Design a protein around this ligand. Sequence first.
Ligand SMILES: COCc1cc2cc(c1)C(=O)N[C@H]([C@H](O)CNCc1cccc(C(C)C)c1)C[C@H](C)CCOCCCCN2
Length: 377
Amino acid sequence: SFVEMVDNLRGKSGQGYYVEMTVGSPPQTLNILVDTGSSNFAVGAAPHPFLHRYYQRQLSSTYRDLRKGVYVPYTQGKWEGELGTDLVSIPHGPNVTVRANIAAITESDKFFINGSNWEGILGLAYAEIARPDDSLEPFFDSLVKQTHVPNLFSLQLCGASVGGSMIIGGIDHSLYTGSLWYTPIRREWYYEVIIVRVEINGQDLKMDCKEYNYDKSIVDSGTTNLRLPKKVFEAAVKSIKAASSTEKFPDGFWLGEQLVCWQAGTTPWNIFPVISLYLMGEVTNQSFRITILPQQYLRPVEDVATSQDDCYKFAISQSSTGTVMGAVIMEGFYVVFDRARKRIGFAVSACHVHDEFRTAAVEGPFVTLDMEDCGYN
Ligand SMILES: COCc1cc2cc(c1)C(=O)N[C@H]([C@H](O)CNCc1cccc(C(C)C)c1)C[C@H](C)CCOCCCCN2
């Protein structure tokens, strides 16, 4: 019965992916962003210039007030609101109804985006990072507790506006080719993983693999970019600069600010390298790799000028809170969040990224010694 959930996600480039949900009795329809980087379910519940609609608690006969406040500060953006419970459904999802915690957003700063078409957020990670604390049961935990839906979900995010699939409760085999490769969920808070090797155009960055996971590595559908710790970011940019020195770019392009354009159809893809991230495997001394094409980390953006070229922003940026495997990493892979077995699976997506002479891939097995040393403590 998973076919009912194929293509249930929509989005705009750089603005996240969302699914349709209803809350309350009678049902109120809202678009909800899917975020594996947080654990709170929250919706606009008061007028805002960028909200087309919002949750109206006064109109739901099943609303219950929890008489407690809540606020969530993300990397970029924040909101505050009031906690309660209500009934929730997913029209293009499993045929069930759950009573869930809901944060009703009353005030916000740089959270809602002008004309994005979503009005709330579904944090899919674990209770340990929920606000105000880990006693607020996240939505997916409530879903599993109250229904027969199995404790796993999968995400197929398709690139550039954009679409995809969230399969709730299983794996849909028509959405990927080849084998799935699994990496352990290191700890149930974020979806935390361990990167054990990095290569650019086949050359090892040759750093202490602890640097790759300082101070953590997470899979985060709610962040656009690949975000790298300072030392790793500097090594990667230096290598991508050298591979592309045939041309030259403003230094603000490498900082993610300025865009770059070429005459339509003449983007020089061949001069940007491929990036391979090796992840810890399921058996002793075994890893596997995923390979990222430049069509993934050069995010296409609308040309604000009168010319009609192809324009892009550099979608790798610096972090001080660990590695973030964001949406441009997840695009073109089928990613399985297998919570029951504490693991995350990767395979080549049916909506994979195309190049002319190169292809995104998930390949294994590889042998990697001392993988346990790569985790940061
Ligand atoms: C260059 O990068 C800046 C950047 C770009 C982006 C997002 C975030 C940061 C972002 O901030 N996205 C957080 C994720 O939840 C963050 N996940 C990890 C995380 C980080 C800090 C705190 C927490 C807590 C709440 C658990 C969790 C979720 C967003 C608010 C959701 C709304 O934005 C979606 C469109 C913008 C996507 N582009």
